[PDB]
Amino acid sequence: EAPAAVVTGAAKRIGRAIAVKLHQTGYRVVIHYHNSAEAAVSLADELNKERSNTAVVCQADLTNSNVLPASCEEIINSCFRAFGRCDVLVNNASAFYPTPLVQGKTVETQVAELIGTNAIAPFLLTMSFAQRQKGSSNLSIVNLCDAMVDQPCMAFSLYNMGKHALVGLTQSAALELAPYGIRVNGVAPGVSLLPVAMGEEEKDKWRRKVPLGRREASAEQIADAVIFLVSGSAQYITGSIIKVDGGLSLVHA
Amino acid sequence: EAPAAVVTGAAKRIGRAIAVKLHQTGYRVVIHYHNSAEAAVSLADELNKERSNTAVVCQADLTNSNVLPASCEEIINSCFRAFGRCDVLVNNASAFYPTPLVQGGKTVETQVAELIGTNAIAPFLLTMSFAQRQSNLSIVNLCDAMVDQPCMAFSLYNMGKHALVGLTQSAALELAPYGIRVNGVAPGVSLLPVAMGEEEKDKWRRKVPLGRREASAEQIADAVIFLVSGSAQYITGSIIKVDGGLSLVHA
Amino acid sequence: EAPAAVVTGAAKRIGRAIAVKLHQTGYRVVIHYHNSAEAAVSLADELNKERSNTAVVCQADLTNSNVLPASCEEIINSCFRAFGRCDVLVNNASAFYPTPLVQNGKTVETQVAELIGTNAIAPFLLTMSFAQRQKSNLSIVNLCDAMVDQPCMAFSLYNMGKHALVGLTQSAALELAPYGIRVNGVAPGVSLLPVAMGEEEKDKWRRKVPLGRREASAEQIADAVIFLVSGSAQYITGSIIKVDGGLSLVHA
Amino acid sequence: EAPAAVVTGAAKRIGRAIAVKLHQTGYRVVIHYHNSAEAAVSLADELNKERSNTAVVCQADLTNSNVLPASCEEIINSCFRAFGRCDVLVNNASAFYPTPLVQGKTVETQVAELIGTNAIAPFLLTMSFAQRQKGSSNLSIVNLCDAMVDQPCMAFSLYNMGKHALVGLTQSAALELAPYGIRVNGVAPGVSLLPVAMGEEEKDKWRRKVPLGRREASAEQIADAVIFLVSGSAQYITGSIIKVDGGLSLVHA
Ligand SMILES: NC(=O)c1ccc[n+]([C@@H]2O[C@H](COP(=O)([O-])OP(=O)(O)OC[C@H]3O[C@@H](n4cnc5c(N)ncnc54)[C@H](OP(=O)(O)O)[C@@H]3O)[C@@H](O)[C@H]2O)c1
Ligand SMILES: NC(=O)c1ccc[n+]([C@@H]2O[C@H](COP(=O)([O-])OP(=O)(O)OC[C@H]3O[C@@H](n4cnc5c(N)ncnc54)[C@H](OP(=O)(O)O)[C@@H]3O)[C@@H](O)[C@H]2O)c1
Ligand SMILES: NC(=O)c1ccc[n+]([C@@H]2O[C@H](COP(=O)([O-])OP(=O)(O)OC[C@H]3O[C@@H](n4cnc5c(N)ncnc54)[C@H](OP(=O)(O)O)[C@@H]3O)[C@@H](O)[C@H]2O)c1
Ligand SMILES: NC(=O)c1ccc[n+]([C@@H]2O[C@H](COP(=O)([O-])OP(=O)(O)OC[C@H]3O[C@@H](n4cnc5c(N)ncnc54)[C@H](OP(=O)(O)O)[C@@H]3O)[C@@H](O)[C@H]2O)c1
Ligand SMILES: Nc1cc(SCc2ccccc2)nc(N)n1
Ligand SMILES: Nc1cc(SCc2ccccc2)nc(N)n1
Ligand SMILES: Nc1cc(SCc2ccccc2)nc(N)n1
Ligand SMILES: Nc1cc(SCc2ccccc2)nc(N)n1
């Protein structure tokens, strides 16, 4: 029987690339999304045309709130409902925007979005993933981290806090879930897919910083590291975060 | 004239030792507390006996909520009101307890609010208010030398402390142009929990390479005092372990 | 045509498993060895039985000395002479023994030479020679140590060598990126234990490992090397992959 | 009676400021030097003018060789000869120059000088320091590290290797010497005193990168962190490396 994977924020960009590569490797996939319903359905249609009944979509907001735990339980339940199992969880979904310390979202919304998506939802999804594992096995979680966590973007404190918290989770969860045979790793992009609304000049400013090829990672390149970590070739690997950054983090100011 | 400092969770233990040393150094102090009003006032009385009108108290819950930003704004405002200035912020207050990932009291979302609130969100909001309201200005965040070798089933706590490292670095960068330095002190084992039994205490003590004992609260405060001093005027984004080598010790 | 790899200290244990997995992946291999000539030759015979003319052996001492740069140049040259190319270098060979700060036959300068030479200087000189011969998926993989920041008592020179190797991995990734040469690391925690180590001591190490209370096989370490030299790692440079079963996360 | 300190490479620059500040704190000092004999003797003169018989010079090459252990032993011996005790060792002396990987001194002498000064000499000095401790007391070692070790300068491999090895030594020696009450820490400058050979435009380019003040650290600012680490206010601190970098290491490419 084919294993099954949940990928959060999988409608487009890195999340889609991960869903696609997992699908190509023989996984059934839950394509979680928030707003990008058309994109998500379009992806699921493509994947189901390749192999029938191997992809479903699952809508949820991952902003922190008192219902977030129920929402995360439901995402995992959706994988079991569709496929009867849940072998892999990929925490990809992420809010990303500045929160300057000095000067229409309230600061409490910002906290709920940036810390919820990047850290609390991963934690709750990890809880639910583990709790459901009830009656060979290759169970794992991959968290999408950030190679620049220690050289952060100016004015991105809450975003960076959430990514740092995700490193914490990756390590704490690896330790705690090891006895259940669930590995927990991370993949840390440098610059991959630039924002759709970023101008070309600004894109190039980033590209030129990258030692290896002076270009951003393809979405596939990021997906490759994920696929490695979920594979049998990584069965002794847990609590590791693999940078996929073309040397960007090694470059001084 | 004298500089002024805010210390969160200053009524007891490490926070109390920090407030005391900052006061001995010549600071006026705001002693923040949540539940420990008696101890907060007793400390303020002691410091005020030494130098009149140099210590005040400030109550607040630092759990994340809809009202936390206003609470944090008021803590900073209390310092300006009492003393006309705020030169130093010490983010010491902290919730600490386990949050197992798997189940065999508090809801998980209350746990998130308390652990991520006290250890990360409140420090962020306080940092915001401190900066907005502005010489040797600095912030010191009480971190945790064991962040990368965490205690089993403490994922939320550890996440909060990791977030606090991120805040420390991000705020150091962003606040450098304003001349506000932002650093951390990372204890290993200092004052053991009051509810911990003596046998467990000795088990932790024996792990510590340097003297096989826990750090006094004074020894933690010493690192804080260095970081806020003129001797650290070029230091920002730095986290000083004060752990007697505990973090270097393998399983 | 088939790519070629140099693996240092490839006669036995982890280096052997790396050489074998590379071979299985389609590489021709230079099996470097110091003292284990019989094991090196037996491996080369095995590999050439599988595919003729796909394995050769290369003897060299990688202790630091005046002649080490020449020795390292010759190891790289051996790959070119045998196979006409050198696509992968794996820096695996390593001296490992205690060097207490306060006090067997060795002088301290010999201990420096052996520990810093094998773990850091020889990898640097090999990296220089590898790069200089580059006139495509070229990469270098350094065998690091996941416990580099929680070191074993009285292993200062060893640990200094392994820290130096992290610095090399990073510096060489940056410098060699314009040549399209990737440089990465694999950091085992506990993998193959010494055969003579008593089982009681072995089991002490095993029980520390969160994931399965066992050491890594050599093959598991090799798997990470194979990923890093592959087309699935084309954007990965300056990264050190821990393969430690969570051992480095475990507090004292 | 007064404690005694050895500072390597103490004739000029950072090492000189360290020796001066230790002396102002009440230490007697061994001013180690290699080529800067005139400056070393001058500094000893100034300190002895302040308090007679509180400073001596000690000449040594700290390049790696078969005689390096003897030379290191002799430095420590010189502190005991002069002052009857050795409480503090500051490993400051450092060779610093590029060693490109792709194509003066032979590569073997570059290894000897860069790895010798930055790593092997510290190690041998640490051995000799610990061994000589015959046996209020506040023994410690401070290693001058580099805040940019993970964001190194292009074509400085051997230098960066030596400084990485020095981090390892700091950690290993902290662990091993803790039972003897010897603390072992580091101070990691970012940009402090710029090379005398560096041109003015280039100096200003480095200054511009520093978030805190857009200026290099003074030697006295670096010495202040050393003074802290050797003091009674750092009694529980061992195996710690304190960055003194004005935020430079936090700044992305
Ligand atoms: N792109 C890069 O260069 C880069 C660099 C470093 C790290 N990363 C990390 O890699 C991952 C993927 O990056 P990316 O650029 O592909 O991500 P992205 O496009 O910025 O966001 C991915 C998805 O996150 C989902 N999301 C945002 N807010 C959400 C919410 N409140 N609830 C539920 N889902 C929400 C969105 O889903 P809908 O569209 O369905 O609303 C969105 O499509 C992220 O974790 C990111 O931080 C990326
Ligand atoms: N003790 C150690 O060995 C150790 C080790 C590593 C790190 N640290 C860090 O060092 C700092 C001091 O440690 P400690 O042991 O002295 O701390 P602690 O006694 O556990 O807590 C200090 C204070 O935090 C305040 N606090 C807790 N929850 C709060 C809330 N919801 N709102 C506002 N305040 C709240 C409490 O104030 P009230 O009493 O007034 O309610 C408490 O007295 C903490 O940041 C801690 O994580 C300590
Ligand atoms: N095994 C582990 O648990 C573990 C843990 C952490 C890191 N690692 C790292 O992983 C790598 C493989 O480990 P391993 O246990 O397989 O290594 P190992 O058996 O201790 O040594 C590998 C080979 O290194 C070669 N070597 C030693 N001294 C040499 C010298 N002077 N010149 C040339 N070669 C020399 C020897 O070759 P000859 O036999 O031909 O003389 C030896 O067989 C090493 O880099 C090690 O540090 C291993
Ligand atoms: N300056 C910076 O911005 C900066 C940045 C990061 C880290 N650091 C570190 O801080 C420390 C001090 O920096 P600095 O700039 O003051 O150093 P420096 O001027 O470059 O060198 C200090 C001294 O090292 C001695 N030295 C060089 N080679 C030697 C050898 N072969 N044997 C014995 N001694 C030798 C020289 O003594 P003689 O003059 O007597 O020959 C020299 O004066 C160094 O460890 C450096 O790596 C400095
Ligand atoms: N860290 C990220 C990045 C992105 S878009 C990638 C990017 C944005 C700005 C500058 C350079 C590259 N989206 C998320 N959710 N998280
Ligand atoms: N990290 C901490 C510790 C403490 S109590 C110290 C302690 C607890 C458990 C084992 C050893 C030592 N309080 C807070 N807020 N944060
Ligand atoms: N880190 C190593 C280990 C070994 S032998 C394996 C071993 C593992 C655990 C304890 C003692 C011995 N060889 C090298 N070169 N490097
Ligand atoms: N790391 C160092 C630096 C220096 S001179 C300071 C400098 C050099 C290059 C760029 C900017 C500043 N000397 C030694 N021994 N070690």
Report the residue of chain D nearest A248, measured CA to CA: D253
Residue D8 in contact with ligand 8 by CB distance below 6 A: no
Tell how far the Cα of C191 is from the centroid of ligand 7, in angstroms: 8
> Annotated catalytic, C45?
no
A244–C232: do the CB atoms touch at under 8 Å? Answer: no
Tell how far the Cα of B191 is from the centroid of ligand 6, in angstroms: 8
- Cα gap A96→A103, rounded to integer Å: 19
Resolution for this PDB entry, in angstroms: 1.7
Neighbours of chain A (3+ CB pairs under 8 A): B, C, D
| Domain spanning D1-253: CATH superfamily | NAD(P)-binding Rossmann-like Domain (3.40.50.720)
Residue type, B115: L
- Cα gap C241→A239, rounded to integer Å: 10
B and C: number of Cβ contacts within 8 A: 31
- What interhelical angle do A68-83 and B108-116 show, nearest 10? 130
**Binding site as annotated, residues of A for NADP(+):** 12-14, 34-36, 61-63, 92, 94, 159, 163, 190, 192-193
- Cα gap B127→C14, rounded to integer Å: 50
Query: What are the domain boundaries of chain C?
Result: 1-252
Residue A191 in contact with ligand 5 by CB distance below 6 A: yes
The pair of structure tokens assigned to B38 is: 């008696």
- Domain B1-251, CATH among 3.30.70.20, 3.20.20.210, 3.40.50.620, 3.40.50.720: 3.40.50.720
Nearest ligand to residue C190 Cα: 3
Which residues, at least 6 apart from D194, have a Cβ–Cβ distance to it below 8 Å?
D203, D206, D216
Which residues, at least 6 apart from C212, have a Cβ–Cβ distance to it below 8 Å?
A178, A181, A236, C245
- C216-249 burial, b at 16+ Cβ within 10 Å, e below that, comes to bebbbbbbbbbbbbbebbbbbbbbbbbbbbbbbb
Neighbours of chain D (3+ CB pairs under 8 A): A, B, C
**Residue A105 Rama label (left phi>0; alpha psi -120 to 50; beta):** beta
**Residue C26 Rama label (left phi>0; alpha psi -120 to 50; beta):** left
- Cα gap C18→C8, rounded to integer Å: 10
Return the active site residues of B: 144, 157
Element spanning B142, H or E: strand B137-142
- Cα gap B201→D16, rounded to integer Å: 45
Tell how far the Cα of A19 is from the centroid of ligand 1, in angstroms: 14
- Cα gap D3→D85, rounded to integer Å: 7
Ligand 1 — pocket residues by CB below 6 A?
A 9, 11-15, 33-36, 61-63, 92-96, 113, 117, 144, 146, 189, 191-193
The nearest CA of chain B is from the CA of A141 a distance in Å of: 14
Report the structure determination method: X-ray
CATH number of C1-252: 3.40.50.720
- Cα gap A27→A53, rounded to integer Å: 11
* Residue A150: closest CA among D249, D187, B147: D249
CA of A12, closest atom in ligand 1: 43
Residue D97 in contact with ligand 8 by CB distance below 6 A: no
CA B170, B175, B179, B182 torsion-angle sign: negative
φ, ψ dihedrals at C24, nearest 5°: -60, -25
A160: Cα within 13 Å, side-chain hemisphere: 28
CA C149, C151, C154, C160 torsion-angle sign: negative
DSSP E strands, D92-156: 139-144
What distances in angstroms separate CA A224 from CA A22, A187, A188, one per listed residue? 10, 10, 12
Report the residue of chain D nearest C134, measured CA to CA: D102
| Residue B156 contacts residue B114 (beta carbons within 8 Å) | no
